[PDB]
Amino acid sequence: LSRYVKWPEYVRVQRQKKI
Amino acid sequence: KSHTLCNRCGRRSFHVQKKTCSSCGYP
Amino acid sequence: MIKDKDSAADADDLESELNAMYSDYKTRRSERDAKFRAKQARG
Amino acid sequence: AQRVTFRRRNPYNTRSNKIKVVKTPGGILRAQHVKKLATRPKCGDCGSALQGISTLRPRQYATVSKTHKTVSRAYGGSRCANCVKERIIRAFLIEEQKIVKKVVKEQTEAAK
Amino acid sequence: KKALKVRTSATFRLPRLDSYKVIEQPITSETAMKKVEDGNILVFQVSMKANKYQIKKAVKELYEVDVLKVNTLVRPNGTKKAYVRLTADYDALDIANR
RNA sequence: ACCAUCGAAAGGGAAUCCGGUUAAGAUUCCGGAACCUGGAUAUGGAUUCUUCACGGUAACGUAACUGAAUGUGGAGACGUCGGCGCG
RNA sequence: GAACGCGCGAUACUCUUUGAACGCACAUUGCGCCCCUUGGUAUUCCAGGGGGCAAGCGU
Ligand SMILES: [Zn+2]
């Protein structure tokens, strides 16, 4: 499947910058 | 019968297959 | 509901989730052609 | 010896429009368009025509009672009798085999 | 401590047409008058933008008659002709004369 | 859970027939007769002690005879040819 | 600019249908939705009118 639709792009990006 | 009436200009220049006008270019 | 907090475990879990999301994105985007699926079979 | 033709817009020999010839009370031969015949409902397991259920068009079922499109047995109107009997027997035997397997398992890990 | 939940969503969703305008003029041809005197039907000319409801209501309001039915057609010259059949309680000849 | 919309007057599709009538109109008008769909409602009957009905071994029959979420099945819905039977 | 009508637009010698053209479609006078209001027995139905619709496992 494609579960990524549980996160919007802005949330995913702002959590990627956390790493 | 390659052409029909054009709504924008009223000429028999609306290509039925292409759905475009060869006189006023609609739309 | 879970009332507990971790300092670095949360960051590691976030990193793992991001890695899984990126890997699934790569697999889904590369599986658009059946040739890749056939190649993976013999991989 | 009087020749008749279609009475509607379609001039072609399509399945949609079909013609019968009848003699009207005026003494003349006239055409009449015939509707498509209805199809008997079929069983959902074996595909055989269901027994005791009226054969109508899809929209003509909404104007008749439930006794004209059902059978008093379980799954009546959906599955025929033999399929229902097979379902009952299979379900009972599956449950019995499940019981037997559970007893055998309880025995086999009862050793330790 | 952080009080976070477990059961989360699998996918994230974003949180000028009156009675006088309707009826332009009656039709007074020989066929129309024959229909008036015989068929109890008034033949009128109406607008392109009027439907059977509006024609019926306009006839009822303007001529104070009961309308049985309205049958409308579009003429080759770009005008609409309406056959308005009235009820048996009214004589179309009387309404035509009046 | 999953994407607008367009694309068939020969594909799928709810339902109307006869008679008569004009200079030129007809399954459209007139006369008679009938169906389809949607809606609000009333009456009778059933829902049998008070609370969602019965019969037959069975195939099944009935004037009715509640049924949410959820999960399915049928009709729509489907190649071509040959002889035989029936209207 | 075009179409249809009586220089003009149903107020026609205010401004119809369009057009960059705008609710959606369109080679169709096809299909909707929203708010107010009026009439026909009318709380339900039907129709007319007016006016519109191109949060985060970041700090
Ligand atoms: Zn079966």
Side-chain angles (χ1 to χ4, degrees), chain D residues 43 45-48 80 83:
Chain D
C43 172
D45 278 338
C46 62
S48 55
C80 62
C83 288

Side-chain angles (χ1 to χ4, degrees), chain D residues 42-50 78-84 86:
Chain D
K42 306 295 195 300
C43 172
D45 278 338
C46 62
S48 55
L50 290 175
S78 195
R79 266 71 168 195
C80 62
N82 302 340
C83 288
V84 168
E86 271 188 275

Side-chain angles (χ1 to χ4, degrees), chain A residues 6-16, chain C residues 18, chain E residues 12:
Chain A
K6 69 188 153 35
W7 293 1
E9 293 179 353
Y10 82 100
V11 167
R12 172 173 80 239
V13 169
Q14 88 174 342
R15 282 175 210 187
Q16 280 177 324
Chain C
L18 289 170
Chain E
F12 182 85

